[PDB]
Design a protein around this ligand. Structure first.
Ligand SMILES: Nc1ncnc2c1ncn2[C@@H]1O[C@H](COP(=O)(O)OS(=O)(=O)O)[C@@H](O)C1O
Ligand SMILES: Nc1ncnc2c1ncn2[C@@H]1O[C@H](COP(=O)(O)OS(=O)(=O)O)[C@@H](O)[C@H]1O
Ligand SMILES: [K+]
Ligand SMILES: [K+]
Lengths: 391, 390
C-alpha cells in the first residue's frame, strides 16, 4: 500500500506558504502539533486531514475506516475548537494552523461538528474518569470539532537532538529494503527496555527464523510524543535503549531504532490497534503484543484499567490489519530459580519476581541493582542516572 | 438461513427429559426475553449466549468476525453471581429456569468477567447514571456465562398477543405466501402517527418507482422490556390496528408482528441490532429516521445521542450486506399544509412538534391533535389509554 503523506510537495511549498499568510489562523498546542505530525507523515493513511464527522463515527463505532477499503483506525484524530473559534472560522473555505507563532498547515473545506466529549471518551476509553491523564486534556478542550483536508507546510522537526530517529513510514520502508530484510517485526514501547521485553523480541526473532525467514529485522519503535508526567522522558529512554543495544541484549546489526511520533492516550485495547496499524503502514509484517498493552492503573483504585489479556485478544481478532500478523505473549517475569526472565507459570508462582517501573525507582533509591539477567547492567546504570537527576 | 436454537419438535421430549436431570439456574423476565431472541434465530449465527471472544468482538467492532462478517452490535449475555459461578463452574450442562419451569439447556459453559462499567461505557457511549437499562445491568452479577443453548418449549407470553409473535422463519414464509417482491421494514416502539406513515408511504411509492410490484411492509413493533413511561405493548397494538383500520396503512400489503427483543435505548449501537434482526427475517429495506433508539439524558434532557447519528452509522455499518438502508429526514406537523410533512427550516414556523406529552396534555383537555397528525380511531385508542392512567 502507498503511504499518503499530507506534506505540500517541495515545488509547491512557497506558493502554499504565501496563501497561508492571508487566511485566518487557529492557534494549536504541542499535542495538536504532534497529531499534525502523525498526519503529515502518513501514519493515519488514507486520511486526507483531520477527521470529518463521517470518519469520526466509523472509528468510534467500528474501529475501522470504511471508505476506500476496510482499514483499521480505532482512535479519533480530530482538531478541537471553542464556540468562539467556531463562530470566527465558520463560513470560510480555508484557514491556517499556527503553533509557536508559525503557520504550520492549511486546513481546507472545514466542517464543524459536535465533539460530544462524554460519548467520545466512553467509547474510546471505556470510561469517563476525568482523572485519566489524556481524558483530563480532552475535557479541557472545546465542544466543537473541525474536520477537513490538511496541507502541511514545513516538515516537522523538534530540534531536540532526536530528529535523526524520527523516520517517516516511507523512510522506514526504504531502510528495510536497504537492509535486505525478508521480515520486519515491530515492538512498540513507552518504557525502558528490560529483559522481559527482550525475551518477547528474541522469541519473536526465533519464531521467524523457524518459519524460514533468513533476515528478520527488529523495528524497536519507542513512542515519542506526549506521555503522562511520571513516564520516563524520551531522551532518557533513548539513552537506556542504546545501552541495551551496546550490551548486545538486542543485536544492533539486525535492529532499527526509530521514534514513533504519536501522543500516548493510555486507552488499552483501543490504542493497541492504533499502535499496530501505524507499524503496518511503516512496512511491519509482524507485531508483538504482551500483557496489558497501552494500559495504566485506574486513577483512584490502583487497579488495571483494562483486563490485561484483552489487548492481545482484541488485536488478534481486529479487522483492517490484514497485511500484518500479531505475535501475542503472556506475562514475562523474573524466574528466581532459573536466574533469567521467563514466562509466568501459576504452578510455580513463588519462583517469579515481578518488577514494575515503580519498583525500579524504589530499588535505585535503596542502592540496589536489579537481579542479574533482569536488565543489562549498563542500561540499569543509565536508569540510576535518570533517577538521580530527579533531585 | 436462520439458526433457530429451539430443539426440533420431534427431539423435544428427549430434551425436556434431559433438562430435568441437570443443575439449574433461575433467570428473570428480561433474561427470558433474550432466550426467546436467541431461540427464534434473530441473532443467527450465534450458538447461544456469547462466549468471551464474541462478546469482545461485538463490544469493540459491532460484528461477529469468525468465518464471515455479520453485524452484531449488542452483547447477548447471561449474567451470574460469584455464588452462581461457584456452583456451576465445572458443569458440562445446566438448565435455565423461569417461573419454576425449565426453558433451556446451556451446554459447554464458560465463565468470564462481566466488566459492567466498561461494558456499559462502550455499549451505551455513556457513563451516566439513571439510564433505565443500564440500571438493571448494574444490579447484575460480575460474571458472564456463554455456551451453546438449546431452547425447549416454544416461548409464549399468554397475553393475547402471541399470534403476532412470528419467528423470522415464519415471517419469511408469510412474505413468500403474499408474493412479496420486496419487504421494507419499520421498527417502532411508540404509537404510529402520520409522520411515521409518511415514511412508510414514501418508501412504498419509491419502491414502486424503482420497479417493484408487490412491496410488503413489515410493521414490526418491539415487544420486550421497555422503560416505565413508554406506552404498553397491548395499547400500542390496539393503536396500530386502528391505523390500519383507517387505511392510512393498507392492511393487504402489510404484515404486523411483534419483535421480542428488550429495548436498550442505546441509539446508534442499538439501531444496528434492530436493523440486522429484520435482515434475518428477510427484509430488503429498512426505514430509519432521526434519533432511532434514542432517549433524553435523564439529567439534562438533551438527546443522549446526536439525532442524525443513527441513520449515518447504520448506512455505513458492516455486516448488513443484503439490506438497503432507507434514511429519512425529520417529519413533523405542517400547519400551513394541515398535514404531516418533511421538516424544513426556511419554513420552520409552519411546523409543530407533537410529542407524547403534547398528546397526554390534549387528552386531559378534550382536545384532539391537529387534523392529519393521527388517524381519528387511533387517537381514540390513545385517549382510552390516557384515561386508564388515572
Ligand atoms: N418525526 C420523525 N421523523 C423521522 N423519523 C422518525 C420520526 N419519529 C420517529 N422516527 C423514527 O421512526 C422509527 C421508530 O421510531 P420510534 O418508535 O419513535 O423509536 S425507536 O426506538 O423504535 O427508534 C425510527 O427509525 C425513527 O427514527
Ligand atoms: N512483563 C511483560 N510481559 C509480557 N508483555 C509485557 C510485559 N511488560 C510489557 N509488556 C509489553 O511490552 C510492550 C510494551 O510495553 P510498555 O512499553 O510497558 O507499554 S505500552 O504502552 O507500549 O504497551 C507491550 O506489547 C506489552 O504489553
Ligand atoms: K466550547
Ligand atoms: K457477583
Amino acid at each position: 500500500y502507498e503511504v499518503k503523506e499530507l506534506y505540500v510537495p517541495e515545488n509547491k511549498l512557497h506558493l502554499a506558504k504565501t496563501d497561508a499568510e492571508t487566511l485566518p489562523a487557529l492557534k494549536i498546542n504541542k499535542v495538536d502539533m504532534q497529531w499534525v505530525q502523525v498526519l503529515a507523515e502518513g501514519w493515519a493513511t488514507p486520511l486526507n486531514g483531520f477527521m470529518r464527522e463521517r470518519e469520526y463515527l466509523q472509528c468510534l463505532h467500528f474501529d475501522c475506516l470504511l471508505d476506500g477499503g476496510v482499514i483499521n483506525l480505532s482512535v479519533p484524530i480530530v482538531l478541537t475548537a471553542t464556540h468562539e473559534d467556531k463562530e470566527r472560522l465558520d463560513g470560510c473555505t480555508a484557514f491556517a494552523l499556527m503553533y509557536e507563532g508559525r503557520r504550520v498547515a492549511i486546513l481546507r473545506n472545514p466542517e464543524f461538528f459536535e465533539h460530544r466529549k462524554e460519548e467520545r471518551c466512553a467509547r474510546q476509553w471505556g470510561t469517563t474518569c476525568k482523572n485519566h491523564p489524556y481524558i483530563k486534556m480532552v475535557m479541557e478542550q472545546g465542544d466543537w470539532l473541525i474536520g477537513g483536508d490538511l496541507q502541511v507546510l514545513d516538515r516537522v522537526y523538534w530540534n531536540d537532538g532526536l530528529d535523526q530517529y524520527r523516520l517517516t513510514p516511507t523512510e522506514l520502508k526504504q531502510k528495510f529494503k536497504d537492509m535486505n530484510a525478508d521480515a520486519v517485526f515491530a515492538f512498540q514501547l513507552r518504557n525502558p527496555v528490560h529483559n522481559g521485553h527482550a525475551l518477547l523480541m528474541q522469541d519473536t526473532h526465533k519464531q521467524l527464523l523457524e518459519r524460514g525467514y533468513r533476515r528478520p529485522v527488529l523495528l524497536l519503535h519507542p513512542l515519542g510524543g506526549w506521555t503522562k508526567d511520571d513516564d520516563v522522558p524520551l531522551m532518557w529512554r533513548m539513552k537506556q535503549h542504546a545501552a541495551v543495544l551496546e550490551e548486545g541484549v538486542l543485536n544492533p546489526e539486525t535492529t532499527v531504532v526509530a521514534i514513533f511520533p504519536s501522543p500516548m492516550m493510555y486507552a488499552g485495547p483501543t490504542e493497541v490497534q492504533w499502535h499496530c496499524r501505524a507499524r503496518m503502514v511503516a512496512g511491519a509484517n509482524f507485531y508483538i503484543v504482551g500483557r496489558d498493552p497501552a494500559g495504566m492503573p485506574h486513577p483512584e483504585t490502583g487497579k488495571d484499567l483494562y483486563e490485561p489479556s484483552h489487548g492481545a485478544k482484541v488485536l488478534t481478532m481486529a479487522p483492517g490489519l490484514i497485511t500484518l500478523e500479531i505475535v501475542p505473549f503472556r506475562v514475562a517475569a523474573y524466574n528466581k530459580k532459573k536466574k533469567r526472565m521467563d514466562y509466568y507459570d501459576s504452578e510455580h508462582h513463588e519462583d517469579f519476581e515481578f518488577i514494575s517501573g515503580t519498583r525500579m525507582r524504589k530499588l535505585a533509591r535503596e542502592g540496589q541493582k536489579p537481579p542479574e539477567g533482569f536488565m543489562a547492567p549498563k542500561a540499569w546504570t543509565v536508569l540510576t542516572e535518570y533517577y538521580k537527576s530527579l533531585e
